[PDB]
């Protein structure tokens, strides 16, 4: 169906400690496939997916010249930014930047996006039409100007609807078994005791992909919510994801409960019933 390749870039100044560190990481949905890290002995963009592995030199050469480029342009923005805000030397700062394009259930493009932020704060994002910017912040127009002007949103608008989607499809193919297939959620249930009157009931979901997913409790067919701990969907560490939703329950009433699970990798959504 729908997919999305998008990039993450993060340079972080470290005064005195030589040059700032730069990191680039690529994803197609929730599958990492390339990376960069000025501190690694690689000094080259690296493959993290079997399907990108099968790209000849032309690829890895280019991706390094470009990450390198990115690696550098941010390196400066870091101080240029520090200027726009006039900040002392002693003290680190972080410049982030993400961009990617998505595609509908037809691989013919859904939308493109390009955002920037200085010090974990929105700096300038590209409006949804991809022809205008949003410089939420005053001396953030200094960049908005240099860009809405120099015509970046123009040849960038060409990348998003162009190359971006094109390569997204090329990857989608080379990685059919990995990218286009799912890993249903293996699920179970734990029951920890809280005390004489209460006892927690936790509904697990491990080894699944995409990381997208929902988890809910239905005591007698009455969904619960605010009183339900809900850990963020966490990385299993092998490509799959796990997540659990637990709820404090009246000791001796567990049977009333049923866990509800939704996941693209499940035909019908499963309704796990604690006491069958």
């Amino acid at each position: 169906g729908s997919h999305s390749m998008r990039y993450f870039f993060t340079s972080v100044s470290r005064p005195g400690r030589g040059e700032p560190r730069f990191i680039a990481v690529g994803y197609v949905d929730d599958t990492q496939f390339v990376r960069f890290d000025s501190d690694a002995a690689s000094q080259r963009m690296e493959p993290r997916a079997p399907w990108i592995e099968q790209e000849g030199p032309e690829y890895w050469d280019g991706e390094t010249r470009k990450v390198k480029a990115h690696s550098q342009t941010h390196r400066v923005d870091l101080g240029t930014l520090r200027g726009y805000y006039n900040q002392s030397e002693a003290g680190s700062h972080t410049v982030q930047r993400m961009y990617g394009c998505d595609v509908g259930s037809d691989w013919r493009f859904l939308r493109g996006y390009h955002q920037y932020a200085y010090d974990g704060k929105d700096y300038i994002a590209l409006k949804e039409d991809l022809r205008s910017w949003t410089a939420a912040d005053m001396a953030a127009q200094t960049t908005k100007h240099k860009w809405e002007a120099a015509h970046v949103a123009e040849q960038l608008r060409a990348y998003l609807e162009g190359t971006c989607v094109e390569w997204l499809r090329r990857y989608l193919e080379n990685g059919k078994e990995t990218l286009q297939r799912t890993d249903a959620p293996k699920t179970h249930m734990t029951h920890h005791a809280v005390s004489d009157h209460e006892a927690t009931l936790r509904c697990w979901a491990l080894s699944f992909y995409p990381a997208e997913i929902t988890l809910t409790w239905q005591r007698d067919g009455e969904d619960q919510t605010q009183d339900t701990e809900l850990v963020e969907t966490r990385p299993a560490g092998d490509g799959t994801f796990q997540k659990w939703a637990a709820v404090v329950v009246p000791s001796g009433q567990e049977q009333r409960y049923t866990c509800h699970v939704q996941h693209e990798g499940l035909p019908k959504p499963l309704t796990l019933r604690w006491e069958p």
Partner: peptide
């Protein structure tokens, strides 16, 4: 692949 060129803020 990667967009290019990338621009300074």
């Amino acid at each position: 692949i990667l967009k290019e060129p990338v621009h300074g803020v």
